[PDB]
Amino acid sequence: MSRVQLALRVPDLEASIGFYSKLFGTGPAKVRPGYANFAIAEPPLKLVLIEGAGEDATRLDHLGVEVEDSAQVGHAARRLKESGLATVEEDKVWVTGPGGEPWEVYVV
Ligand SMILES: [Cl-]
Ligand SMILES: [Fe+3]
Ligand code: NA
Ligand code: NA
Ligand code: NA
């Protein structure tokens, strides 16, 4: 299995933590200065909140797919490259959509 990662740059981290705790009925899995994440089972989602400093509105930071093991990351990396996309591998692999939105496929 795998789940989507959504990372949002938010103007107010504390405000956003409260909102998302209510929306998904669970508290954050990890909290750091300027950073929080939620691990949501239903719907399957890794939500990342990154505080933006002087942001007027929430915007997309990056997107991703969190997968079960490094083998899956390698499979995705090879398949994406075979499909003709430019990739950057780190475990994770990055690709960028034509409008500039970045995607990471990674394992935690
Ligand atoms: Cl924590
Ligand atoms: Fe991420
Ligand atoms: Na802090
Ligand atoms: Na849930
Ligand atoms: Na994928």
UniProtKB/Swiss-Prot annotation:
EC number(s) from the headed UniProt entry: 1.13.11.-
Coiled-coil ranges (or none): none
Top EC group: oxidoreductase
Record GO terms (molecular function): dioxygenase activity; metal ion binding
Cofactors: Fe(2+)
Temperature dependence: Exhibits robust catalytic activity from 37 to 55 degrees Celsius.
Binding-site positions, roxarsone (III): D61
Catalytic activity, as annotated: methylarsonous acid + AH2 + O2 = arsenite + methanol + A + H(+); roxarsone (III) + AH2 + O2 = 4-hydroxy-3-nitrocyclohexa-2,5-dien-1-one + arsenite + A + H(+); nitarsone (III) + AH2 + O2 = 4-nitrocyclohexa-2,5-dien-1-one + arsenite + A + H(+); 4-aminophenylarsonous acid + AH2 + O2 = 4-aminocyclohexa-2,5-dien-1-one + arsenite + A
Alphabetic keyword roster: Dioxygenase, Iron, Metal-binding, Oxidoreductase
Subunit: Monomer.
Role this protein plays: Nonheme iron-dependent dioxygenase that can break carbon-arsenic bonds, playing a role in the detoxification of environmental organoarsenical compounds. Catalyzes the oxygen-dependent demethylation of highly toxic methylarsonous acid (MAs(III)) to arsenite, which can then be exported out of the cell. Can also cleave the C-As bond in several trivalent aromatic arsenicals, including roxarsone (III), nitarsone (III) and (4-aminophenyl)arsonous acid.
Something else known: Organoarsenicals are used as herbicides, pesticides, antimicrobial growth promoters, and chemical warfare agents. Arsenic is the most widespread environmental toxin and is classified as a Group 1 human carcinogen.
Protein name per the record: Trivalent organoarsenical cleaving enzyme
